[PDB]
Amino acid sequence: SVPTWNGFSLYTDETVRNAARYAYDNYLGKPYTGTVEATPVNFGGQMVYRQHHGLAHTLRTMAYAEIIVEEARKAKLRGESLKTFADGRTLADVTPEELRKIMIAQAFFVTGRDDEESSKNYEKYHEQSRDAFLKYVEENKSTLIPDVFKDEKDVKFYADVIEDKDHKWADSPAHVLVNQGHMVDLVRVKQPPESYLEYYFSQLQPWIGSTATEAVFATQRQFFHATYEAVAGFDSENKEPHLVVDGLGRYVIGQDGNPIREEGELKFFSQKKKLEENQRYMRVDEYLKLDEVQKRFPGAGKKLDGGLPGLKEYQYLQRLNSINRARCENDVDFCLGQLQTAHHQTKIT
């Protein structure tokens, strides 16, 4: 039912690790040249140029790809029916050779950035990310073709995925894994955590199933701990307004006990669209017990504290500040070691 594996893994494959080293040495380890958050940090002792979209971020996306495919394979073997692409394949049908090419593309996905600017440099930044990827391949034709990429057409496909000029984020396993892998890493920063977790969960769930998706986010938390990145809290009784992530909007309760719906689907509300008297924004806790949300999101009624047991805010922050975080952001081997440890931890016992 599932394609035979190479023994291939992010943590042992030399080609994938070489691409990561290259991406760090020539881009991720270099100072930002833009101006939005382009100032470097001296992590309690050493420099980190790109704390947000840097080496540790990049490696985590690649690690997400490894675990998403792993769990997709188990999901297919359980007899679950996963969402298909046009060629009939699911994420469970990703081959080892294909996952390798995807991870190499992932290594270069944010190399093209010049700072942490949110919006107006999207095209430019991915073009320079694409250009970095093509330059690396060209400088290593001898070893990469045909042994890794079949030919220039194969190379072009992944260059286009990186480029992302038309935003076909669901066209192929490569598109899904590169984009959702990049996207799910935002759990390290986004608030309200409950809104974002439910959102990302629902984005991933159709491809690998609910059980596989839970395992991914459970593993992600340990990926964060291991790379000295922040682990979000989850409270199903959170009273702050629910954030509609797609479009950054809101849902509204009218004078009815009920929330306002279209004609039925919940009515999207913009942040700047002012309300009627006796209307209010829907709270996180209200959204989570919505029956349609209860059915699709199994962690809807969960309560799970973030950070670490026994540490207070500034203590936890100081931990995330340590030189060990800098080591994850500057040492490919060390960071991969940490991720490998967190990846396999549940399997030891």
């Binding site: 704390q51 608030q191 979000a232 500034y314 936890y316």
Partner: protein, 74 residues
């Protein structure tokens, strides 16, 4: 008047506040309960980060509102 400051790690900081303590002061109020140096503070309201020298009622924050506290490494 009370406002709510929420961290990523899922903590809700109930503050006792009056309509226009400037944002330095609330960041100084936060330093007094969690010990966090303002150097490392970023306060968000309605997706907007509150520049200092300005102040609360300027950003129109009334009772029972929710803000976000985002930590900066040093």
């Amino acid at each position: 008047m009370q406002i709510f400051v929420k961290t990523l790690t899922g903590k809700t900081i109930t503050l006792e506040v009056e309509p226009s303590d400037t944002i330095e002061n609330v960041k100084a109020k936060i330093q007094d309960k969690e010990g966090i140096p303002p150097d490392q503070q970023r306060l968000i309201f309605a997706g907007k980060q509150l520049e200092d020298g300005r102040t609360l009622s300027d950003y129109n924050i009334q009772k029972e509102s929710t803000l976000h506290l985002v930590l900066r490494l040093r």
